[PDB]
Amino acid sequence: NAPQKYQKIKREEFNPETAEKNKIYLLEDQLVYLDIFGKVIDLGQTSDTCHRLFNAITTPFYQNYILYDEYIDPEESAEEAAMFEMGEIVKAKMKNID
């Protein structure tokens, strides 16, 4: 059941009715899971945390990408640390989806 993908998105571009379902969306002030039914589920992060993650992930390849990339190394860049941090947040929030 669990999502495998995420993307950054701007708030005025995020339309749950037409966005890809079962996917994580990182906005500049919120982190959400769009579940398989199209329900936006908040993932409990402060706007400040989200602003930091949103702005740390700058590589074009990583704007719309996979959640648990085995080749990410948080010790090599702030971007990869932020991607790994988001993955750990999502993993914890998805703990009981299966």
Author numbering: 128 to 225
Give the original sentences from the paper that presented this experimental model.
Here, we demonstrate that MavC actually targets the Ube2N–Ub conjugate to catalyze an intramolecular transglutamination reaction. MavC-catalyzed transglutamination proceeds via an obligate thioester-linked intermediate to form an isopeptide bond between Gln40Ub and Lys92Ube2N. Architecturally, MavC1–384 is composed of three distinct lobes: a core globular domain (CG) flanked by an insertion domain (residues 128–225) on one end and an α-helical extension (HE: residues 33–66, 356–384) on its opposite end. Ubiquitination of Lys92Ube2N, located adjacent to the E2 active site, effectively inhibits Ube2N activity and attenuates downstream host NF-κB activation.
The MavC insertion domain can be expressed and purified on its own, and a crystal structure of the insertion domain shows that it preserves an identical fold to that in the full MavC protein. BLI and glutathione-s-transferase (GST) pulldown experiments show that the isolated insertion domain is able to bind to Ube2N independently and with an affinity comparable to full-length MavC. An analogous NMR titration using purified MavC insertion domain (MavC128–225) yielded Ube2N spectral changes that are remarkably similar to those observed with C74A-MavC1–384 despite the large molecular weight differences. These observations suggest that the MavC insertion domain is primarily responsible for binding Ube2N, a conclusion supported by similar Kd values obtained from BLI measurements of Ube2N binding to MavC or the MavC insertion domain. The insertion domain appears to behave as an independent Ube2N-binding domain but when built into MavC its rotational states provide specific functionality during the transamidation reaction.
